[PDB]
Structure 1
Amino acid sequence: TAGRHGDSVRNSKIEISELNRVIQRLRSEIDNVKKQISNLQQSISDAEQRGENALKDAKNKLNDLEDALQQAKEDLARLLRDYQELMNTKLALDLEIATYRTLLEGE
């Protein structure tokens, strides 16, 4: 019967067109995801080099600070031994003074 046959051929052809457009859509989206992936890998390597540079800079900063700390300690120690010396001297002079004072006391 004519109608049924025209219908079979026609709906098959149209189903084929349909399928072919969705195949194209799918392949396009797979291409998308592959490009995203590529970008992600590049971003990983980038993040690595950035992180390493940061670590290096920070380590240099810290090293400089350790050296500065040691230096400040040495400054302080020098100052403290100088102070000890000075104090010894001053105590000698204090001795003289207190002897004369005790002299005035007995009178």
Structure 2
Amino acid sequence: LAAKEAKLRDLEDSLARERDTSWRLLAEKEREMAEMRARMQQQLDEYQELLDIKLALDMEIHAYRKLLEGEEER
């Protein structure tokens, strides 16, 4: 018992410091992933926004294609 209650106290000192570090880090990751899942959903939308624009231009190209079809026919 020369330094036996000094090491047991230093153990709970680092275990508290460890758990603390691990929790600030975990918290940092869960915030970083939430930010990621946010950009990911915004993206799937920004895409569907564009894919809907694309399908309308695909229809217009068919209409103009039909106009010409009936125009260029002799």
TM-score class, shorter-chain normalisation, is 0.7 to 0.9
Alignment of structure 1 residues 8-27 onto 2, 5 Å = none
Q: Which runs of 4+ in 1 moved over 6 A?
A: none
Q: How does 1:1-107 map to 2 (within 5 A)?
A: 37-101=1-65, 104=69, 107=73
Larger Rg: 1
3-state SS of 2:3 partner = helix
TM-score scaled by length of structure 2: 0.80
Between the aligned residues of both structures, percent identity stands at 29
| Higher relative helix content | 1
SS at structure 2 position matched to 1:38: coil
Deviation string for 1:49-104 (max 9, x for gaps)? 01110100110011111111101111111111111111101100001223344563
Q: SS of 2:2's equivalent? A: helix
